[PDB]
């Protein structure tokens, strides 16, 4: 596990929710798409988006 600096985007890949992460102290070239279950709290992203 690595510290997440920011969540940049969200996509659904055959039912499966993934998010585009910037990792803290790594450049954008290192950004990755991660399945939701790789995050400690994906609910915070969902709650943020579903409230608009």
């Amino acid at each position: 596990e690595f510290v997440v600096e920011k969540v940049l985007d969200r996509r659904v890949v055959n039912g499966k929710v993934e998010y585009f992460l910037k990792w803290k102290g790594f450049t954008d070239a290192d950004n990755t798409w991660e399945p939701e279950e790789n995050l400690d709290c994906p609910e915070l992203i969902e709650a943020f988006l579903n409230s608009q």
Binding site: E1, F2, V3, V4, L21, W23, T32, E34, N38, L39, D40, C41
Partner: peptide
């Protein structure tokens, strides 16, 4: 807080 996640 500070969050962490598994990287692929």
């Amino acid at each position: 807080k500070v969050h962490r996640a598994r990287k692929t």
